[PDB]
Amino acid sequence: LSNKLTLDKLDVKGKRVVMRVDFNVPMKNNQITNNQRIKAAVPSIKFCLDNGAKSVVLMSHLGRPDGVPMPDKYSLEPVAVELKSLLGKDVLFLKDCVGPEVEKACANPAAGSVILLENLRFHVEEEGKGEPAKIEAFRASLSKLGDVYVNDAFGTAHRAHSSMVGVNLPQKAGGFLMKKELNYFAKALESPERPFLAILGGAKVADKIQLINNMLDKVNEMIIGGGMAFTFLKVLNNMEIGTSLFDEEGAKIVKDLMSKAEKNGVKITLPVDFVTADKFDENAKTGQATVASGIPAGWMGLDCGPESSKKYAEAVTRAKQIVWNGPVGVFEWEAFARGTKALMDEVVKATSRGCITIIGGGDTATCCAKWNTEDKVSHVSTGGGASLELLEGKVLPGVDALSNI
Numbered sequence: 001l002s003n004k005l006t007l008d009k010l011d012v013k014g015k016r017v018v019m020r021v022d023f024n025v026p027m028k029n030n031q032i033t034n035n036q037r038i039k040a041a042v043p044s045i046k047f048c049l050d051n052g053a054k055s056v057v058l059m060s061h062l063g064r065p066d067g068v069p070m071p072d073k074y075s076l077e078p079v080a081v082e083l084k085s086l087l088g089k090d091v092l093f094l095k096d097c098v099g100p101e102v103e104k105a106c107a108n109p110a111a112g113s114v115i116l117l118e119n120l121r122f123h124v125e126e127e128g129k130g131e132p133a134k135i136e137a138f139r140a141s142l143s144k145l146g147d148v149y150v151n152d153a154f155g156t157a158h159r160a161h162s163s164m165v166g167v168n169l170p171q172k173a174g175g176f177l178m179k180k181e182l183n184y185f186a187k188a189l190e191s192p193e194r195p196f197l198a199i200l201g202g203a204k205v206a207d208k209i210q211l212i213n214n215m216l217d218k219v220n221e222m223i224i225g226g227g228m229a230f231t232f233l234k235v236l237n238n239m240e241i242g243t244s245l246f247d248e249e250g251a252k253i254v255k256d257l258m259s260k261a262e263k264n265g266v267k268i269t270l271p272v273d274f275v276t277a278d279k280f281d282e283n284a285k286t287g288q289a290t291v292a293s294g295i296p297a298g299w300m301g302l303d304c305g306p307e308s309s310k311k312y313a314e315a316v317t318r319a320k321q322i323v324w325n326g327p328v329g330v331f332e333w334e335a336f337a338r339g340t341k342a343l344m345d346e347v348v349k350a351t352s353r354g355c356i357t358i359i360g361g362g363d364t365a366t367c368c369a370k371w372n373t374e375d376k377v378s379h380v381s382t383g384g385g386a387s388l389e390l391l392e393g394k395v396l397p398g399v400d401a402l403s404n405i
């Protein structure tokens with residue numbers, strides 16, 4: 001961020017600060033299961049208050065409500081409660097993020113006010129699909145809520161969304177989390193230790209399958225696991241995949257990706273066996289399958305099996321550096337957690353013998369919280385997709401939109 005305004009050089013005295021954060025925290029049974037992302041923003045928030053900010057107005061998305069209000073399902077209200085405990089200051093939660101009422105609440109607040117707005121993605125203008133003059137008006141409304149802007153939303157920095165690139169204030173500064181994460185990656189990605197392994201799992205198949213092409217120019221091995229694998233196996237192996245996650249568009253590039261991996265000498269490790277489920281539920285009936293057997297119709301692969309874990313372990317053993325985004329099964333549910341646990345065990349062991357190990361993402365970092373490995377790997381990032389986009393070698397839109405020095 002040498003070329004960008006950052007918070008250390010932003011005069012906040014008597015200024016209202018409007019701050020984009022990534023508070024897209026994981027939730028199970030209605031409760032926050034990991035406050036990592038909230039804690040991570042506290043240094044920037046406290047710095048603003050300690051240096052005389054009139055207010056700090058915090059804004060984030062939560063999940064993918066796709067531009068419809070879904071307060072029953074994706075409200076940020078529970079955040080606002082957690083943030084109080086972590087800050088040691090109270091926080092006022094607003095039930096919207098624009099409108100005349102939000103604008104009044106933020107126009108002239110009492111000294112030291114911390115305000116959290118409701119989920120930005122309840123409005124289609126944030127993404128904005130899920131409307132050009134309404135996008136302008138949305139961006140204009142957010143811009144009224146502060147005198148200066150800070151973006152600390154590392155985990156969202158890959159998204160050219162209204163709150164991330166569209167705020168129109170004179171000073172647009174990178175926050176301390178943005179800086180810490182970008183600095184860590186700049187150093188780790190400059191001359192990676194090799195073999196450099198990427199582990200790509202998770203559930204955001206449509207988006208993340210599109211990152212593989214450029215990642216194949218940077219890494220020496222790739223594990224393609226979790227929900228990502230089934231698109232590959234359907235195409236390459238003619239495997240029956242049942243109701244497992246599948247991306248029609250990404251299927252069309254699978255063979256080209258494998259051709260490129262071969263051209264670039266990148267070893268691809270796909271799973272060979274699975275724990276299956278009869279529905280997407282923690283208490284689903286379960287089974288087992290191999291690539292050869294296929295997955296029965298109406299069943300989904302929600303974890304890898306033991307032979308896959310062995311192949312993943314082999315790749316981790318060869319690695320001198322690892323970047324991991326996306327669990328290799330639905331680790332939130334114990335029936336489907338073994339593959340991710342086993343991989344975590346391997347990644348911790350790799351770290352202990354000198355491997356540089358980087359785990360990132362809202363959900364993947366929660367694997368570290370669950371199994372108490374946050375201090376047993378080299379770096380746990382609040383960015384997952386954002387970190388993969390750095391790995392590709394791109395400038396992130398949320399960084400690009402900051403003020404130049």
Ligand SMILES: Nc1ncnc2c1ncn2[C@@H]1O[C@H](COP(=O)(O)OP(=O)(O)O)[C@@H](O)[C@H]1O
Pocket residue numbers: 201202203204225226227228245301302303325326327328329330331332360361362363364365384385
């Ligand atoms: N085979 C699978 N089918 C469906 N979901 C999966 C599978 N494997 C992993 N997942 C899910 O992937 C989710 C996380 O993916 P993603 O959001 O892309 O990662 P991150 O949060 O680290 O950026 C987890 O909630 C996990 O349950």
Ligand code: ALF
Pocket residue numbers: 155204360361362363382383384385386
């Ligand atoms: F769910 Al992510 F990076 F894609 F935290």
Ligand SMILES: [Cl-]
Pocket residue numbers: 203204205206207208
């Ligand atoms: Cl996606």
Ligand SMILES: [Mg+2]
Pocket residue numbers: 361362363364
């Ligand atoms: Mg996630």
